[PDB]
């Protein structure tokens, strides 16, 4: 968010059984808050980020699926199979992040555990961890945001470079790839 | 539910702050000294006491969680007060930092032993004393995390 240091917390709203029933009915009456949403399909659990009034995540996780809302299942707004992107209209009550304009290379990744990991940009869609971590830690964090020192969105977490069970580098989808998915079509 | 990283501590005399980094509650020697912390099971002895670096440490209490030390080397620091206000600070050395907006001395009083965070929210150091000229503070003085990390390897 706007200025100050990036700090985060996590709140669980549903259990395994509660998730399964609302996945099949597609009806979710629960109240929504925050910028980042912890998503699930029962079988797999990951992350979703709100940038520009739209809730984005990875295609390798959600596919061509619908999101559960208070009015029933909501169809996707954007689907970009090649850039590994998916988008639905941001749920009522969620806050959106503004794309980065400062061009900084000191990125900060937010995990599902609500921890903030320091990342250094090493390319257009590549960055390296300042402290190498085990692969288990990064699991469930796909679709999560990479923030700049101001707390603005640089990109969404896609894949980790794993050698022996430890990850030294991360792979992401940059914010400019989102805006060209908005300007494209199908 | 809900654990704090920063504790608001008090002696018979003054009142200051205490920050949990790596399973241990740290604060300034000029506030606690060789004192013990209160717990429902009795007084707890200090795990570390470094009189030279103005450091004191006891094991982390109940209702607390630890801050992870900074690994990004950023110079854009942020001070957290006893009132929970965040002050932007620029690093001007190993243990020195300047305020972007010069505040009166009262504003910083009792915020010693508090943390100085980097943009990731990770601990860079502990607020020790404020640099005062005429009653207005323009800069701050701190104990960096690498002093805490060596005092542990001992």
């Amino acid at each position: 968010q706007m200025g100050a240091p990036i700090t985060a917390y996590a709140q669980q709203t549903r259990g395994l059984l509660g998730c399964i029933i609302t996945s099949l009915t597609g009806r979710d009456k629960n109240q929504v808050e925050g910028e980042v949403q912890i998503v699930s399909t029962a079988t797999q659990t990951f992350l979703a980020t709100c940038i520009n009034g739209v809730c984005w995540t990875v295609y390798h996780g959600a596919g061509t699926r619908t999101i559960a809302s208070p009015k029933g299942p909501v169809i996707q707004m954007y689907t970009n199979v090649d850039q590994d992107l998916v988008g639905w209209p941001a749920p009522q009550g969620s806050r959106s992040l503004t794309p980065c304009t400062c061009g900084s290379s000191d990125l900060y990744l937010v995990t599902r555990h609500a921890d903030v990991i320091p990342v250094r940009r090493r390319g257009d869609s590549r960055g390296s961890l300042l402290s190498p971590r085990p692969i288990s830690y990064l699991k469930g964090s796909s679709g999560g945001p990479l923030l700049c020192p101001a707390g603005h969105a640089v990109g969404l977490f896609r894949a980790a470079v794993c050698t022996r069970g430890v990850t030294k580098a991360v792979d992401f989808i940059p914010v400019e790839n989102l805006e060209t998915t908005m300007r494209s079509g199908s | 539910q809900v654990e704090g990283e920063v504790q608001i501590v008090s002696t018979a005399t003054q009142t200051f702050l205490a920050t949990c980094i790596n399973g241990v509650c740290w604060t300034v020697y000029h506030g606690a000294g060789t004192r013990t912390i209160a717990s429902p099971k009795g007084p707890v002895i200090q795990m570390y006491t470094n009189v030279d670096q103005d450091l004191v440490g006891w094991p982390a209490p109940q209702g607390s969680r630890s801050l992870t030390p900074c690994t990004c080397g950023s110079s854009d620091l942020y001070l957290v007060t006893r009132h929970a206000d965040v002050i932007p600070v620029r690093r001007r050395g190993d243990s020195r930092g300047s305020l972007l907006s010069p505040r009166p001395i009262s504003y910083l009083k009792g915020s010693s032993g508090g943390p100085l965070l980097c943009p990731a929210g990770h601990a860079v150091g502990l607020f020790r004393a404020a640099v005062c000229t005429r009653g207005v503070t323009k800069a701050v003085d701190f104990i960096p995390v690498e002093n805490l990390e060596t005092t542990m390897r001992s």
């Binding site: 700090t7 | 654990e3 920063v6 008090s10 002696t11 004192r35 209490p61 957290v80």
Partner: peptide
């Protein structure tokens, strides 16, 4: 005397359900 805890501060800003 001892050092007592008179309050706590959360950095994350977590409200508590």
């Amino acid at each position: 005397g001892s050092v007592v805890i008179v309050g706590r501060i959360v950095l994350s800003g977590k409200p508590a359900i």
